[PDB]
Amino acid sequence: AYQTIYPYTNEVLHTFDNMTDQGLADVLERAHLLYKKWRKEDHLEERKAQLHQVANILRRDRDKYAEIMTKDMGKLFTEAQGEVDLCADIADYYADKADEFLMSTPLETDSGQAYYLKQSTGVILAVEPWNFPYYQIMRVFAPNFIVGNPMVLKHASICPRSAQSFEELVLEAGAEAGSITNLFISYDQVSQVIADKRVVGVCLTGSERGGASIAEEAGKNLKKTTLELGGDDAFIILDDADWDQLEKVLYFSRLYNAGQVCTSSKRFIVLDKDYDRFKELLTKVFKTAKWGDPMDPETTLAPLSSAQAKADVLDQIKLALDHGAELVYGGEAIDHPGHFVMPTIIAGLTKDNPIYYQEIFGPVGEIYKVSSEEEAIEVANDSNYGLGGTIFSSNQEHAKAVAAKIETGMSFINSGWTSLPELPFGGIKHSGYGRELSELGFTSFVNEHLIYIPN
Template identity: 55%
Template sequence: MSYQTINPLTDEVIKTYDNHDDAYVEKAIAKGHALYKKWRNDPVESRAAALNKVADVMEAQTDELAKVLTLEMGKRFLEAQGEVAICVSIARYYAKNAAEFLKPEPIESSIGPAQTISRPTGVLMTVEPWNFPYYQIMRVFAPNFMVGNPMLLKHASYTPMAAGAFEKVVSEAGLPDGAFTNLYVDYDQVNHIIADDRVQGVALTGSERAGQLIAAEAGKSMKQSSLELGGSDPFIVLEDADLSEIKKIIGGARLYNAGQVCTSSKRFIVTENNYDAVLDMLKTAFAEAKIGDPMDATTTLAPLSTSNAKQNLTKQVKLAVEAGATLAYGSVEQNLPAAQFEPVILTNITKENPAFYQEFFGPVGQVYKVKDEEEAIALANDSHYGLSGVVFGGSADHAAEVASQLETGAVFVNSFGGTLPELPFGGVKNSGYGRELGRFGIETFVNKETIVTKHEPIDLNDAFGGFV
């Protein structure tokens, strides 16, 4: 596996990185494990100031860090600045709230005082993707740093500069050696790391196939795991929806980050009377998108992350059209240079079409016509994925009732979903399992240890219900 920084606007190779050898990996695991043994007896509060310092360093270096994302994976500079900002807020959120989340919980017990205490589990291995290079790291790093779990990172081969930049932030913030280590390694090395007894958990955000492989390796070694594997998120427009509100956000719901967002709206499911209007809105939003240099503030649609991503997405569109889908906007042939991609809208997609169950990771929108909300719910749930969704309706209460029937990890009513530190993030079905962010996000790799205190001898017949 070769780690390279390639500018997706021009396809220029900026830098090639040497992989870390097994000796370097061993030292990283050993440092992390030594730090875990020290941290496991330290109070959670003792790490809050250090995590706030990480936030301070990131905030002070916002523009520098954002430029790395723009150069390396093509993210619009304004969006890259926003990614740094959400990382800062996640770090501050856990620095402020972790002690409360992890405080001992008393339990009523018939045999004496009892409580659960939250303990770190050990070194974690994380495998992260290229679409939000800092945010994906911070979602795992911030809560687990507060817990006391040191972190090893294998980032995407497309974003080695961003991985190194995050490690540099941690170092400049003065965190102890071993708290966070970036590794340029291949998947064979990842498997060996997961199998190491000193490593006690693995978190992955990535493709469905990558998730299957990592989950299998974690299972072999009986390691805890958390997976976020993408989605084909529905955007439901009910009969009484306020179309003027939809018009404001429909373009961004699909085109933010060049459509390379697991939780972006990919399937627009619209009742018959609103179908033409919503389709026209999406066409207009796509037509108004300005494709160009992501450093240019007037650009609204940046290139895809790599030319390879462009080739794969172009092939998906071509196969969908060959299988009978209607090309309602855009072109099958993509003639823009490097990784730039002209938006596409597909309609009339049947269940027999391979596109029906696929995730299109880029600026491709699918629009479906349904007769009523029951059909909309059924269509939304007829998916291998279940990460997020949107429901628009005139009555927020009724739209929320519809939202509650969707098989997904989160639903946003009358708004397009974003990310906030306090909102749990994760999915069901092939979108993975486990949660990041919020209170749940700090509990994934925590040992909930039960402590029972009894000052008098216990009658085992009473304790075990007469089975002894």
């Protein structure tokens, strides 16, 4: 069912009706016709203006959209405001970059005249998750809208107001109906969407189980995909780390969005010499957490997004301890109807402990002790994931050199993750493939169309 249930109170705020098969067919036809219209007639300047207006309305109504996200999935209102801010920038970015990103590309050849165009292809299915309900949509809506690929959206079951309001936002901005349409549909209907010939690509952000299910169905139907999945990012503290600067980023690095971030700093990798010192430092930082009402500006730790999310995180902590890990800090129950998990730190994970290799989507710090920088890299790369990661080092060339040795899509130097419209975002291994944002995130579903005139 599609329901808004506030994670702070566990109470129902909204219930939404499912889309019928005929409603879905009607939406796909409308989207296909819009694709054809944008191919036949030049409406680029209108779409650029409309995307700027999306950003404008997000600015005007920021607190409205921020609260919608908090009420859907529980995140701190301040974090949700920041998410709106980033969405504003992404929309403005792709509208501003439209002409440059759509320009024909000459090809060097002495055999004739050659270039390629960057053209729309059709209707794109976006499958997006609850942890960043707006940002994950905007990352794919903005570039696809600019090139002229209408979008249909299947969002998380627990953020239906976010999903519905996003469609409403785009219509409010003046975009033609069909530019994006939210689909309150079943998994079986999703399969039908993927098999529909009007649909020409699927972009997914979410879990690797959802990713595998969707990518399998897309492959069956010859549909191109991009996958933005989870991570188990290594935050590697080198022998020349600045420990003052280190302390200042730790809370954000693991506890932002209550740790429910694919690029959360999930595996801290620390040298033996520094191990006791880091245990104490991370404990100090985690102790500062104040859980409670995510609408309250004093609150610095949100409840998790659902009862199941909380259960799963608690079970993972328990699994870790049952297989020999050390409980360093926390792990005690929070007595409140909201889906709260207290900041918890574990260490002593060995390779035969399942949690050594599992992503924990909650506020769980993990400390991996290593004996050398070589081993730090080995442990960092001994992962089924490879999304982000951090290198902490006061020597810039040292930091860059270690970063290049990590098998991962992103390396953040002396800092936890961030995202900006101009920076490509994506991973390797079970973290997925393809890139979103920057110019790399513009061409995923464009037809690079060669035109060749031989001499």
